[PDB]
Write a structure and sequence with these properties.
homodimer, alpha/beta, Rossmann fold, Phosphoglucose isomerase, C-terminal domain, 3 domains, five-stranded parallel sheet, globular, monosaccharide binding (chains A, B), Glucose-6-phosphate isomerase (chains A, B), gluconeogenesis (chains A, B), SIS_PGI_2 (chains A, B), glycolysis (chains A, B)
Chain lengths: ~575, ~575
């Protein structure tokens, strides 16, 4: 039986029909409702009050989570049970961030071995290697300190890493290297050309234009190359790795010097060996770590500990861990990722809102949305349930976004007056670079933040035809045009307000979304952990590859059966 | 009367219901249909064959364009008629790219003046100024050549510019500065630290973290600052301008030296004067240039001619112009932007596909999607028709995307197996940085391109349960799991294949989308040219601004009426 047949789902269909006749502006006058829909965990508030439900409807959503046995399923995941039912695998990204003091108390036995011993064996290796790179114990072939890091990887092998890298770099440069303090503003004399300011680049696209971007103004002698691929056979990553090895070899000709400049994050020891990577330079991860959940494994912990130091990355892991513990243990009504997943499920299923806008009011979060896109869409963009039945109900929404105020000046016209798009706004009390001049009405960070509060309220409340008509008493615009100025309101939003974006809080933010996606897959009754949808395109691309090979070299080999359109475009492409 | 009442619309409702029972795989075996749905204009092919229509249904879409008088409306726009009916304004971004030889033959008289004289007066000023900056005639306060350009502007004042900047920079560095030739590959010795390699930065967010990113490792003495704002009062832009002027003044203390480092793109001559910008340093644009259509005015032409030289920008303008001429003059059945707009309208209205994925298989197009998002969403994300009637039918889709293969490794799981998302794939025959090693099966650019063809075909054809079952004869996966591997297909795509991404072709690409959006607004019967939806959020943010001002300074002023949730979060934010 499908989720749509559950008693609590059928009840939500009728409750949502009544919710559609209610205005958010009226709900926002109820202080009791606001107090119930605003939750606090550590250094942050989550505000669900601008969502189209009464406390009674949210209680029914909790009854739905109970009816699908969400807590039982989340617990099985954390315990190491084979919840990835199509690949028959465990899902243990949460084990990556369990701290050393819990190695025995929080043990997870897979194939008669405590997996936390493997987790910590790798983390100790990263701490040592990154400390050695940063202290100049490990040097380049010219006996100098490394200055650049090229990370080569696709999808999950870099998206999470780039999100964290861009989010944290200025906190690290400003608060740590430049020792900026909260009472001080206008730190324009901050130095960015000093020790341990690594020029980190992500070589993700197989497009050779991306190799061009990766190598731009870099000296091979200052560059460490990290190749991220579980199999060490990934087509794009490995072609990029071979290309970057050729670039390194333009200057670094000796194999032993070349091995000082290359590292791998992989388990294929045979292939890393063949590539010329030393054994001390291979960092492992496990099959129970999904690509889109891999940033807390060596995939992200190794390049981020090189860039920022292991101590900072340990704090990030503690953040992930504390949010994981909250997700597992908190009662559903007080469980932040669960309530966020229930809200998303409610908007998509009962209002048919098939989009989510991820809008952090923080420019350093410019790469967060791109990571959330894979994490959400690749996990939950499915059409077959956990009972192997093809399904027709809504699965994952389309996720998109740009940091505020950028997204605000780009596409909010549609968010206010076009199709309804639920938004998730993320804001902080403090900047990574506070600016304030004496004559200004507000600090620049306060100016940014006026929009964080106002946008959420404008979406919820709108502006009626009569309010537009009242303002027109002075404007005197032609009255037939007034309809163009109406804001219907009832456009939902979630507000996430943290005190500061530090390493610990960035961990809380990552785990919050990883937890939300895991909870949502169980609510949708789909497998969040596989990705069978990526196969067809790869198979067909291999056929085009062979055709390109035979055509470019004018050498017959393979049989081709291209459709009529592809034959016309291939002829143009190859002429 | 609404568009939904038109004879041809009512006919499309019934034709689309039959189209839903037809498979793209069958249509793709018809060479005649493929030849009809593949169009050629200059140096490119547009392939509409993987769209869910027969040639008969596309002819009905053309009858719909005729019934809404699309050609009459497009002609009125090009002629300078006040088609922006809510603001009573002309829409003349197409006049920005009319070449000098057509100044009289293609004249447009607005307020008894040929607007082409104003267009060319500004273009001549840009050519002279950019030539002078690039030849070192115009120097810094230290009598050296400028090295950096900080563009300060929001929304339309930078999105188009950043798209073109990122798209063209490597073509300019590789083909022009390094003189790379098409027969040669592996140009790893290309030099990027030479004359006229400008370090262009875009300061768009009011977040002070963006000021930090803009000034990172820059010397005030090498930096030219361009402030882009029609009114010179835009809150975010002007706070950023004041902040950057303070940063410049840390080293450049004299007003006359400060004026050598500052330029404005504005019409408010009183305010540019007050800011300390010299009269020769103010570049004008007109009210008939919409922000999201402003890249071909001084907004984009000035910073891009500094970065690349006016001659390159003149070729970009010629590209825009040639596509504009095609859009205006081509018969509807042979009109590329019209057919693209009709396809978009058809997918959204008749299939209820409310999303568009913009997927260029070219890393240098990494900023194209962000520009297309504003251009589409802000123009067409409306809910009131041209007859001032509130409407309930679909308007602009949600636009999103990442360049291929990046987007491919991120969210294509959903595009293949989750909700149906029409895609627009953009590819080139040549790279900006060709790479090829002797032992490789294909050049890196060919490897990228195998995916361009394969993805379009995989989306169209899918893979049936019986094809999955046949492959399982060897794999022997548990048979109940086979449903997870099915690809339903019939997922539509448009392919755009150009020979090369040069300045002229980048102009063709920009105009193609500007033309498509203009055509689509007329098909939707909405006003593509206004943006009343941005008002409410600004008004409410000003109230939060005053509250922040009174609270931070502990000084009473204004009356506040915040809802119950905002009061709770404001208290947290301010404590």
């Amino acid at each position: 039986m499908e989720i749509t047949n559950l008693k609590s789902y059928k009840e939500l269909v009728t409750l949502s029909a009544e919710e559609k006749t209610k205005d958010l502006k009226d709900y926002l006058n109820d202080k009791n409702r606001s107090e119930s829909l605003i939750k606090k965990f550590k250094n942050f508030y989550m505000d669900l009050s601008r969502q189209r439900y009464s406390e009674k409807t949210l209680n029914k959503l909790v009854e739905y989570a109970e009816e699908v046995e969400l807590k039982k399923k989340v617990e099985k995941t954390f315990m190491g049970e084979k919840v990835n039912m199509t690949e028959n695998r465990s899902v243990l990204h949460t084990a990556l961030r369990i701290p050393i003091e819990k190695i025995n108390t929080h043990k997870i036995i897979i194939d008669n071995k405590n997996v936390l011993e493997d987790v910590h064996g790798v983390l100790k290796k990263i701490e040592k290697y990154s400390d050695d790179i940063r202290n100049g114990v490990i040097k380049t072939c010219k006996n100098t300190k490394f200055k650049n890091v090229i990370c080569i990887g696709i999808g999950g092998s870099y998206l999470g890493t780039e999100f964290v890298y861009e989010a944290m770099k200025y906190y690290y440069y400003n608060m740590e290297l430049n020792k900026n303090e909260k009472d001080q503003v206008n730190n324009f004399n901050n130095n960015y050309d000093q020790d341990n300011v690594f020029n980190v680049r992500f070589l993700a696209n197989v497009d050779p234009n991306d190799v061009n971007r990766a190598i731009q103004n870099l000296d091979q002698y200052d560059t460490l190359v990290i190749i991220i691929s579980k199999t060490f056979t990934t087509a794009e990553t490995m072609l990029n790795a071979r290309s970057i090895k050729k670039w390194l070899s333009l200057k670094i000709k000796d194999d032993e010097n070349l091995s000082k400049h290359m590292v791998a994050v992989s388990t294929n020891l045979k292939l890393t060996d063949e590539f010329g990577i030393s054994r001390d330079n291979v960092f492992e991860f496990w099959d129970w770590v999904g690509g889109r959940f891999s940033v807390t494994s060596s995939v992200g912990i190794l390049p981020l500990s090189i860039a920022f130091g292991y101590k900072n990355m340990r704090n990030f892991l503690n953040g992930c861990h504390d949010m994981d513990e909250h997700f597992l243990h908190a009662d559903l009504k007080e469980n932040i990722p669960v309530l966020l997943a229930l809200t998303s499920f409610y908007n998509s299923h009962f209002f048919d809102y098939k989009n989510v806008a991820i809008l952090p009011y923080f420019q350093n979060l410019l790469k967060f949305s791109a990571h959330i896109q894979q994490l959400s869409m690749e996990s939950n963009g499915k059409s077959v349930d956990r009972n192997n039945q093809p399904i027709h109900y809504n699965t994952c929404q389309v996720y998109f976004g740009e940091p505020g105020t950028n997204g605000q000046h780009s596409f909010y016209q549609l968010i206010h007056q076009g199709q309804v798009i639920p938004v998730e706004l993320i804001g902080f009390k403090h900047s990574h670079f506070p600016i304030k001049f004496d004559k200004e009405v507000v600090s620049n960070h306060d100016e940014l933040m006026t929009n964080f509060f106002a946008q959420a309220d404008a979406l919820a409340i709108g502006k009626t035809y009569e309010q537009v008509k009242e303002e027109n008493e002075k404007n005197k615009m032609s009255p037939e045009l007034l309809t163009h100025k109406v804001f219907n309101g009832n456009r939902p939003s979630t507000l996430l307000l943290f005190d500061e974006l530090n390493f610990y809080t960035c961990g809380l933010l990552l785990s919050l979304y990883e937890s939300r996606i895991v909870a949502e897959g169980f609510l949708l009754n789909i497998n969040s952990f596989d990705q069978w949808g990526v196969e067809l395109g790869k198979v067909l691309a291999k056929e085009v590859r062979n055709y390109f090979n035979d055509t470019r070299n004018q050498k017959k080999s393979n049989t081709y059966n291209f459709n009529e359109s592809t034959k016309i475009l291939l002829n143009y492409y190859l002429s």
